[PDB]
Amino acid sequence: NQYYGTGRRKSSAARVFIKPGNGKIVINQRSLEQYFGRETARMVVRQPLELVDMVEKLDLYITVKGGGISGQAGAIRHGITRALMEYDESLRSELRKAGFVTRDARQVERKKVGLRKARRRPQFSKR
Amino acid sequence: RIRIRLKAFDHRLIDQATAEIVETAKRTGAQVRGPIPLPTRKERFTVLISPHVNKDARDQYEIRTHLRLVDIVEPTEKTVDALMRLDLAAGVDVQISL
Amino acid sequence: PRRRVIGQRKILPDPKFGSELLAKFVNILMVDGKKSTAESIVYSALETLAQRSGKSELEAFEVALENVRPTVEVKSRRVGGSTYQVPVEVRPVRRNALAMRWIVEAARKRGDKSMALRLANELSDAAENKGTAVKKREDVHRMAEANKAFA
Amino acid sequence: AKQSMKAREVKRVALADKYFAKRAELKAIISDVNAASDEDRWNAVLKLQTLPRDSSPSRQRNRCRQTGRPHGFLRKFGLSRIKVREAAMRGEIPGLKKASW
Amino acid sequence: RSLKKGPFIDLHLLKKVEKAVESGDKKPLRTWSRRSTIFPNMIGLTIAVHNGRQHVPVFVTDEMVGHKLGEFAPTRTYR
Amino acid sequence: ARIAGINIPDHKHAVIALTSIYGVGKTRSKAILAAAGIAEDVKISELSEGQIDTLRDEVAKFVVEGDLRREISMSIKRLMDLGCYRGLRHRRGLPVRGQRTKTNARTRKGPRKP
Amino acid sequence: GQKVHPNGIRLGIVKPWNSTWFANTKEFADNLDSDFKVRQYLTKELAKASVSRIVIERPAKSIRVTIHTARPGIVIGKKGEDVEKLRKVVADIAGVPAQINIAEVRKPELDAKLVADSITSQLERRVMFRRAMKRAVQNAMRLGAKGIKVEVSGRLGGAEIARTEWYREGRVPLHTLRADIDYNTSEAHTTYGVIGVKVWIFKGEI
RNA sequence: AAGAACCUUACCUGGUCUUGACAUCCACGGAAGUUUUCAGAGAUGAGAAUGUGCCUUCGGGAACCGUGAGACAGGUGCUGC
RNA sequence: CCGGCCGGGAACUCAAAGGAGACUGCCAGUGAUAAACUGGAGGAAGGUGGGGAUGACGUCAAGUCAUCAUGGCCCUUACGACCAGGGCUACACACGUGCUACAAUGGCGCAUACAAAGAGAAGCGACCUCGCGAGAGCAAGCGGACCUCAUAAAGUGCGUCGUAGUCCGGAUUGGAGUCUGCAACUCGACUCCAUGAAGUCGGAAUCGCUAGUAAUCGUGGAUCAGAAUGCCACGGUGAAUAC
Ligand SMILES: [Mg+2]
Ligand SMILES: [Mg+2]
Ligand SMILES: [Mg+2]
Ligand SMILES: [Mg+2]
Ligand SMILES: [Mg+2]
Ligand SMILES: [Mg+2]
Ligand SMILES: [Mg+2]
Ligand SMILES: [Mg+2]
Ligand SMILES: [Mg+2]
Ligand SMILES: [Mg+2]
Ligand SMILES: [Mg+2]
Ligand SMILES: [Mg+2]
Ligand SMILES: [Mg+2]
């Protein structure tokens, strides 16, 4: 049928529908080649497809909004790892012993008052 | 048809404002679309805590404002008049829409 | 830290040809957080090296890194008062990274034209080890050996 | 904060209420691009000074209603930061708890 | 560089200048309206602009027309 | 490469090479090059003479080089003659647009030495 | 001063607000000001009636004042005519109308405002601050309270220097947010100047 | 100081006010207000027309406005040792 | 008319409530069979998960009597009051904190991608028109997850620039303007045109920072008629190192 997965690296919240079929990776109409397939980390969306082969096994209907380039991409990776539940834990044995499934929160720290940008102390002066 | 929208400050005060504005309507004339959450408006303030000098030290306050939709997709007569002179729940402002 | 026996972070392997070692190199080139431009320069520099040397990249960036790579270095370790230099073997993990740092630091000077050009050239001179970075390695060695009386 | 200053302030407020937001038409209307661009508009920028130096809202310093402090003001509350905190901690201002996100 | 529609003048100074020129030349005019521009019809009158504690007379000439009065009344003396 | 008062550059795109003329910056240079029909990508060395004159007739319309110079000399001097506040600042070698004089103003006030 | 205000830090959790009225972003400020008005006035009048607190709720464009006090009889007076008078003069500045509701408290020695104003009223009458402070603590703890600490500060006794002295009994955890702690400061004007008498009362674990 | 062109403003120069810009008390006269004019930097000074309400002890009212007399008012004046 | 634009759907995102979850709880080993510790498992999260709030007895007779309250003292035809104009913006100089730089991981031109948080009615002001531009005119919608401020910028593609004080830098000044406001001279912001300074990475010295932190990139708010490189806040990209 069709299997869903969420994932949401840094702010951005991807949604990864996945099905068996053609090797094309569609995302918000834009091809994976043209959404960010030319820039660096073009394959971080294709990472959870190494130990669990893709090639032509499954087509991906991915959607994403919010965050930025790499953040969106991370969200997509996570969303795929969550979407790969059709063969359950047997995939997660190697899928987890390689990261991927970890939510990896680490959001931006709020700016602290009196400071300048969360950690940067506004220049001490002895005298 | 009845676009009721009610907002407040204390969240768990409007919980029973909505539960009660929906009960005293949904039971006597039925129909409801439930308490639609809506985003909470959060105004923040960053006042200086010291009467003089000491810019570094500040308190930051906020005023959470919780909105709630009601919606009643039919102008039920036992309900449309159960809104007027049957509202109450002070501390919570409620604007009915036609 | 005073107590924290924390481990090393795990970086992502290079997006192009798999090489975590030089992805580590790219990181030590990323000015103002722009990993993109930096990595573009890395690549450009490695294509103009795969041509002028005939070697690939994982082997071209190899037979060049070993020539700028330190074996023993100094760092003062005073015992009971006097603070004289004490030569000690550099950990392998820090080893190569330190070598890459010297390479890039050299690429910040020796102003050819384009940054990619400069870095590529740097690796080129590291090939027959006559560049500025290999000189850095040499002097780091002079700090030891000639001052290796301390042990 | 100097009773004099408070007075000055309230006289400015009210006297400003008397004229403008009512007789702001002298410049908001007569001062426009049309046929009134002739001597009428000039008569306007003339008459605009017949009014007292105040009346204009750009002379309401807008102080605290309690202490009358000219600085550290919050248009949301109308109170000085010192007084808004001093009241907030007493549970005066509704829904004003300490933010901590 | 300001006020795109019509020059600015204070009424007591505008009318003072009108009545002055229409009556003929006399003596410097004590005005405080440094904010006011200088009309062409003001050429000749040596009105005295207030500086903050005195009044400096200035014989308005053919060039001192576009400038305002405050341009010709230096206040903060320096050494 | 000799139009107007001077302009003698080389191996530069027509626009930047016309910016070399005192009295005309970039935008005005584009105006010129559109008024001459010449593309703004070609270098003066590539630019034929028959076009050089057409540029000349166009740059003559705008006040440039020495004429502009004595226009500025006329302005600043006239200001110093009137004795207005701006000219008054001109004579004392201090900022005119009302800049902080207390600390900076090191361009107008001159180099820091005494 | 470096400690947070006990009441503010709990306004959301255990403690409630004194003012209870949602307002639009416009008439919020002005309304708040009228509030401050009716509060300062009402307090300046019913001061002899030993008022602990007032709750200014505002339903349906009509203001409603509540007065938690230890002496509801003095507040109302005979037949409750004082109630009426107050409804008049107070409703006037609040925008009108103003139904008021007095609220009795049979445990006055446990309200921080009441204890504070008590110690204060003793302090104006030349009585020794130690006898008053310790008296208050004593009566509080034996009346039924898990904790209480009082604190006086100023010229106290007519000294040339100011010295703060606090006396406590029981458990009073200011950091435990689930803890219900009463708190009130009250200036005590004397012949030698103002003497602050701030008091904490740990009423309960929750 | 989370924002000095005027105001803010506490400073300076000049022109001014004095129970006073802000509060209550008493006597006395006037609905309040609004339109507009002249002198002046303006403050203020001098007017000119209009309107002349809510309770009748109706020698008074509840506000509002002006002079009178003394209480006082007012101070971002000094001392955070 | 491919705009979730329309039916319709409540799955999914997000929204806001109510709950669940992590406790060294389980496992090994160590340790006085104690607390505890090192490791493993599972787990979204691992041992105070991240961050914030919360500041003990006191110390500094720290700071504020100019926010406010108040004891003294002092003025009280004045040190109180009103108004106009000036000043708080002066400048041989000295320091603190910032911003923009010195360039090619860069400037410039064209094309194009991806945010969160907000704010808003004597306010936000689409659309359309004219203006090189700031803006002006006309005038919807919106007290709002719907309407607006509002195109995020770095980035990415392509073209040019060749290491010169230069197509770097953008100060300074001239001219012409727009906007708010009674009024922009003293002393506003912004736009256009021209001008085009120092500066080639900084002596002695010194500061910040262990992660989504530093660095760099833009956005919004409060104050506010107008007036930020400041303050507060949001998101993008995103390290190095810790023996
Ligand atoms: Mg006072
Ligand atoms: Mg203002
Ligand atoms: Mg001023
Ligand atoms: Mg005087
Ligand atoms: Mg002290
Ligand atoms: Mg001291
Ligand atoms: Mg001091
Ligand atoms: Mg003044
Ligand atoms: Mg200053
Ligand atoms: Mg440029
Ligand atoms: Mg130079
Ligand atoms: Mg740390
Ligand atoms: Mg290490």
Coordinates of N, CA and C in Angstrom, one line a residue, chain F residues 52-107:
Chain F
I52 N 33.9 56.5 -30.5 CA 34.6 57.4 -29.6 C 34.0 58.8 -29.7
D53 N 33.9 59.2 -30.9 CA 33.3 60.6 -31.1 C 31.8 60.6 -30.6
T54 N 31.0 59.6 -30.9 CA 29.6 59.6 -30.5 C 29.5 59.6 -29.0
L55 N 30.4 59.0 -28.3 CA 30.5 59.1 -26.9 C 30.8 60.5 -26.5
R56 N 31.8 61.1 -27.2 CA 32.1 62.5 -26.9 C 30.9 63.4 -26.9
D57 N 30.2 63.4 -28.0 CA 29.0 64.3 -28.2 C 28.1 64.0 -27.0
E58 N 28.0 62.7 -26.5 CA 27.1 62.5 -25.4 C 27.6 63.0 -24.1
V59 N 28.9 62.8 -23.8 CA 29.4 63.2 -22.5 C 29.5 64.7 -22.4
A60 N 29.5 65.4 -23.5 CA 29.5 66.9 -23.5 C 28.2 67.5 -22.9
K61 N 27.1 66.7 -22.9 CA 25.8 67.1 -22.4 C 25.8 67.3 -20.9
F62 N 26.6 66.4 -20.2 CA 26.7 66.4 -18.8 C 27.9 67.2 -18.3
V63 N 27.7 67.9 -17.2 CA 28.8 68.7 -16.6 C 29.8 67.8 -16.0
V64 N 31.0 67.8 -16.5 CA 32.1 66.9 -16.1 C 33.4 67.6 -15.9
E65 N 34.4 66.9 -15.4 CA 35.8 67.3 -15.2 C 35.9 68.7 -14.6
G66 N 36.7 69.6 -15.2 CA 37.0 70.9 -14.6 C 35.8 71.8 -14.4
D67 N 34.8 71.7 -15.3 CA 33.6 72.6 -15.2 C 32.9 72.2 -13.9
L68 N 32.8 71.0 -13.6 CA 32.2 70.5 -12.3 C 33.0 71.0 -11.2
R69 N 34.3 70.9 -11.3 CA 35.3 71.3 -10.3 C 35.0 72.8 -9.9
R70 N 35.0 73.7 -10.8 CA 34.7 75.1 -10.5 C 33.3 75.3 -10.1
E71 N 32.4 74.3 -10.3 CA 31.1 74.4 -9.8 C 31.1 74.2 -8.3
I72 N 31.8 73.2 -7.9 CA 32.0 72.9 -6.5 C 32.7 74.0 -5.7
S73 N 33.8 74.5 -6.4 CA 34.6 75.6 -5.8 C 33.6 76.8 -5.7
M74 N 32.8 77.0 -6.6 CA 31.8 78.1 -6.5 C 30.8 77.9 -5.4
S75 N 30.4 76.6 -5.2 CA 29.4 76.3 -4.1 C 30.1 76.5 -2.7
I76 N 31.1 75.7 -2.4 CA 31.8 75.8 -1.1 C 32.3 77.2 -0.8
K77 N 32.9 77.9 -1.8 CA 33.4 79.2 -1.7 C 32.3 80.2 -1.3
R78 N 31.2 80.1 -2.1 CA 30.0 81.0 -1.9 C 29.5 80.8 -0.4
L79 N 29.6 79.5 0.0 CA 29.2 79.2 1.4 C 30.1 79.9 2.4
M80 N 31.4 79.9 2.1 CA 32.3 80.5 3.1 C 32.2 82.0 3.0
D81 N 31.8 82.6 1.9 CA 31.6 84.0 1.7 C 30.4 84.5 2.5
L82 N 29.3 83.7 2.5 CA 28.0 84.1 3.2 C 28.2 84.1 4.7
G83 N 29.1 83.2 5.2 CA 29.4 83.1 6.6 C 28.3 82.3 7.3
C84 N 27.5 81.6 6.5 CA 26.5 80.7 7.1 C 27.2 79.6 7.9
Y85 N 26.3 78.8 8.6 CA 26.9 77.8 9.5 C 27.7 76.7 8.7
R86 N 27.2 76.4 7.6 CA 27.9 75.4 6.8 C 29.2 75.8 6.2
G87 N 29.3 77.1 5.7 CA 30.5 77.7 5.3 C 31.4 77.9 6.5
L88 N 30.8 78.3 7.6 CA 31.6 78.5 8.9 C 32.3 77.2 9.3
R89 N 31.6 76.0 9.1 CA 32.2 74.7 9.3 C 33.3 74.5 8.3
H90 N 33.0 74.9 7.1 CA 34.0 74.6 6.0 C 35.3 75.3 6.3
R91 N 35.3 76.5 6.9 CA 36.5 77.2 7.2 C 37.3 76.6 8.3
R92 N 36.6 76.1 9.3 CA 37.2 75.6 10.5 C 37.6 74.1 10.3
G93 N 37.3 73.5 9.2 CA 37.7 72.2 8.9 C 37.0 71.1 9.8
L94 N 35.7 71.2 9.9 CA 34.9 70.3 10.8 C 33.7 69.9 10.0
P95 N 33.1 68.7 10.4 CA 32.0 68.1 9.7 C 30.8 69.1 9.6
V96 N 30.1 69.0 8.4 CA 29.1 69.9 8.1 C 27.7 69.3 8.2
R97 N 27.6 68.1 8.0 CA 26.3 67.4 8.0 C 25.9 67.1 9.5
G98 N 26.5 67.7 10.4 CA 26.2 67.5 11.8 C 26.7 66.2 12.5
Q99 N 27.9 65.8 12.1 CA 28.4 64.6 12.6 C 29.0 64.8 14.0
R100 N 29.1 63.7 14.8 CA 29.8 63.8 16.1 C 31.2 64.3 15.9
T101 N 31.5 65.5 16.5 CA 32.8 66.1 16.4 C 33.7 65.7 17.6
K102 N 33.0 65.4 18.7 CA 33.7 65.1 20.0 C 34.7 64.0 19.9
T103 N 34.4 62.9 19.2 CA 35.3 61.8 19.1 C 35.9 61.5 17.7
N104 N 35.0 61.1 16.8 CA 35.5 60.8 15.5 C 35.7 62.0 14.6
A105 N 35.0 62.1 13.5 CA 35.2 63.2 12.6 C 36.7 63.4 12.2
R106 N 37.3 62.3 12.0 CA 38.8 62.2 11.7 C 39.1 62.4 10.2
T107 N 38.1 62.3 9.4 CA 38.3 62.6 8.0 C 38.4 64.1 7.7

